[PDB]
From a paper:
Within these domain boundaries, there are 29 amino acid differences between human [name] and mouse STAT5A, which are predominantly located within disordered regions and the SH2 domain. Conventional phospho-peptide binding occurs perpendicular to the central β-sheet with the phospho-Tyr accessing the N-terminal (pY) pocket on one face of the β-sheet and the flanking residues occupying the C-terminal (pY + 3) cavity on the opposite face. The pY-binding pocket is positively charged and harbors a number of evolutionarily conserved residues, such as an invariant arginine (R618 on βB5), that form part of the complex phosphate coordination network. The hydrophobic pY + 3 cavity serves as the peptide selectivity pocket and is predominantly formed by the βD strand and αB helix. As such, the surface-exposed βD strand controls access to both the phosphate-coordinating βB5 position and the selectivity residues located deeper in each of the N- and C- terminal pockets. The SH2 domain is a hot-spot for several mutations with the most prevalent mutations occurring either on the βD strand (such as N642H) or in close proximity ( < 5 Å apart), suggesting a common mechanism of action.
Unphosphorylated STATs form an anti-parallel dimer/monomer equilibrium, and upon efficient recruitment to the cognate receptor–kinase complex, are phosphorylated on a specific tyrosine residue, which promotes parallel dimerization by conformational rearrangement. The activated STAT dimer translocates to the nucleus, initiating transcription of target genes and altering chromatin involved in loop formation in enhancer-promoter landscapes. The canonical domains of the STAT family are all present with the coiled-coil domain (CCD, S138-T331), DNA-binding domain (DBD, F332-V470), linker domain (H471-D591), and SH2 domain (Q592-P685). Archetypical STAT-type SH2 domains are comprised of an anti-parallel β-sheet created by three β-strands (conventionally labeled βB-βD) surrounded by three α-helices (αA, αB’, and αB), which are also observed in [name].
Numbering used by the authors: 138 to 185, 189 to 389, 393 to 427, 434 to 537, 541 to 559, 562 to 632, 638 to 661, 664 to 685
Write the structure that this text describes.
């Protein structure tokens, strides 16, 4: 990529200028030592007093003062140049930190946000986030560069303070040393990211896993004394108040908190959470209130001087006491993961969303749950729109759907999302390859399937989703069409749809014989 090349070239450029500055600092150190050892001779000659005899006394005193004025010129003539060297060095340091601020903002506020958005979208079966072993190298190099610069600034300040030529150096060194602290604090607080999220909607008293990382921890000696991270859970209100610096030392109780291990090869410092559990929750619609898992730690960098308390918020989660509440709550989660604004307060979401983005997210999670590449075609989306009217997708191109109208009761005990997720479940458990084989209609309705089997020969099939039961399917036949009572999930768990079809009906979905579609799925 062009941006990758740009930022890598910028990284190598920063490394080059930092090595330049290190060379200049070493030269300044050796030069100051030379200046001190040459200065010692000024005191050596300022005592060569003796009181021998008036003639030689006056002659030698005049000669000594004539040498002393030349020494007082030579010195301070070299010292002014030393001060100029130091000022130029401080200017180089300041320019380096300006470039550092630019590059760090580019890394954090642009690329990490992209990775986190990819994570949110993979939450609903989008493209996977991607390995952290590309941002890891960038962050490690950032940390190395800023640490070398802080070290150079510190040693330059100490070496200039032992020979304190006042000048303007003290101001510039109260400054840009003022800026390195902001840079390193932003970095250490912003590289505590969640690698593998804790699962969205999760039931109590069930084990779940989550893994966090410290990106820059590989080089900053925090792995020497590895800090342990603790995981808590807080409702949306406490999560909002926390970012507002409202000190509140809530939500529910976890069962585990653990230390961060280190991979010596990839140089990654990470905390795995493999046996976490939620045993008690303090709730204030149960399937709609969102919680978040906060991970927090505290550690030190270098000596005992630099301490950092760091915290990170995991993506919103919904607690589900009884298992039967699962299917609904996921909707809420998806909605957040579908429409999270960039700079929004924790779990703030726009009540009404456009239809195209809605069917986009629906197709995404559908291709996710079915584990197939069939997805929602244009006619299927048109049918879904007609369920929630005219039969052109261009008509629904500018309509808006509220959350209340999404997950209501369109015409029965359903709610549109619940029916969609029910068909998702029924073909995710028993009808994955049958959906991938092009055998389930998916966009067939009453009197829409009937007109598709009148001009066709006898015995043809069509498997649509039943609009009487939630997770069931209805078939077709051959004068009039012959439906049936819905095939409940149980009716598949006892004899799947592949063997239930095994005699009178021979064709599916015009000409394709029943065997050529289901011969590889009968019980031998």
């Amino acid at each position: 990529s062009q941006k990758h090349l740009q930022i890598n070239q910028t990284f190598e450029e920063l490394r080059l200028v930092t090595q330049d500055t290190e060379n200049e600092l070493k030269k300044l150190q050796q030069t100051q030592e030379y200046f001190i050892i040459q200065y010692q001779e000024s005191l050596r000659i300022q005592a060569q007093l003796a009181q021998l005899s008036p003639q030689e006394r006056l002659s030698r005193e005049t000669a000594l003062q004539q040498k002393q004025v030349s020494l007082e010129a030579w010195l301070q003539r070299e010292a002014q140049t030393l001060q100029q060297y130091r000022v130029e060095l401080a200017e180089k340091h300041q320019k380096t930190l300006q470039l550092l601020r630019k590059q760090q903002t580019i890394i954090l506020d642009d690329e990490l946000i992209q990775w986190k958005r990819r994570q949110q979208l993979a939450g609903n079966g989008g493209p996977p986030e991607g390995s952290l072993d590309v941002l890891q190298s960038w962050c490690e190099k950032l940390a190395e560069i800023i640490w070398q610069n802080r070290q150079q600034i510190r040693r330059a300040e100490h070496l200039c303070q032992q020979l304190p030529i006042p000048g303007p150096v003290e101001e510039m060194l109260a400054e840009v040393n003022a800026t390195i602290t902001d840079i390193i604090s932003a970095l250490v607080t912003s590289t505590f990211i969640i690698e593998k999220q804790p699962p969205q909607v999760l039931k109590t008293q069930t084990k779940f896993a989550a893994t966090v990382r410290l990106l820059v921890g590989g080089k900053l000696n925090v792995h020497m004394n590895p800090p342990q991270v603790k995981a808590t859970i807080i409702s949306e209100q406490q999560a909002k108040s926390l970012l507002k610096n409202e000190n509140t030392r809530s939500g529910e109780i976890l069962n585990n908190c653990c230390v961060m291990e280190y991979h010596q090869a990839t140089g990654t410092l990470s905390a795995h959470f493999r046996n976490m559990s939620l045993k008690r929750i303090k709730r204030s619609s149960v399937t709609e209130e969102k919680f978040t898992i906060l991970f927090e730690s505290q550690f030190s960098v270098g000596g005992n001087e630099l301490v950092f308390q760091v915290k990170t918020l995991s993506l919103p989660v919904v607690v589900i006491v009884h298992g039967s509440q699962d299917n609904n709550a996921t909707a809420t989660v998806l909605w957040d993961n579908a429409f999270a604004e960039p700079g929004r307060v924790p779990f703030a979401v726009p009540d009404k969303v456009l239809w195209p983005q809605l069917c986009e997210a629906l197709n995404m999670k559908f291709k996710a749950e079915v584990q197939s590449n069939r997805g929602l075609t244009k006619e299927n989306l048109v049918f879904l729109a007609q369920k929630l009217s005219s039969s052109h997708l261009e008509d629904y191109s500018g309509l808006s759907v509220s959350w209340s109208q999404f997950n209501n009761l369109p015409g029965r005990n359903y709610t549109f999302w619940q029916w969609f997720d029910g068909v998702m479940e029924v073909l995710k458990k028993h009808l994955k390859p049958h959906w991938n084989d092009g055998a389930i209609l998916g966009f067939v309705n009453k009197q829409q399937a009937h007109d598709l089997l009148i001009n066709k020969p006898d015995g043809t099939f069509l498997l649509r989703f039943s609009d009487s039961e939630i997770g069931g399917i209805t078939i077709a036949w051959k004068r009039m069409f012959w439906n049936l009572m819905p095939f409940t999930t149980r009716d598949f768990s006892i004899r799947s749809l592949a063997d239930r079809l095994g005699n009178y009906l021979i064709y599916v979905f015009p000409d394709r014989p029943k065997d050529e579609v289901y011969s590889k799925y009968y019980t031998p």
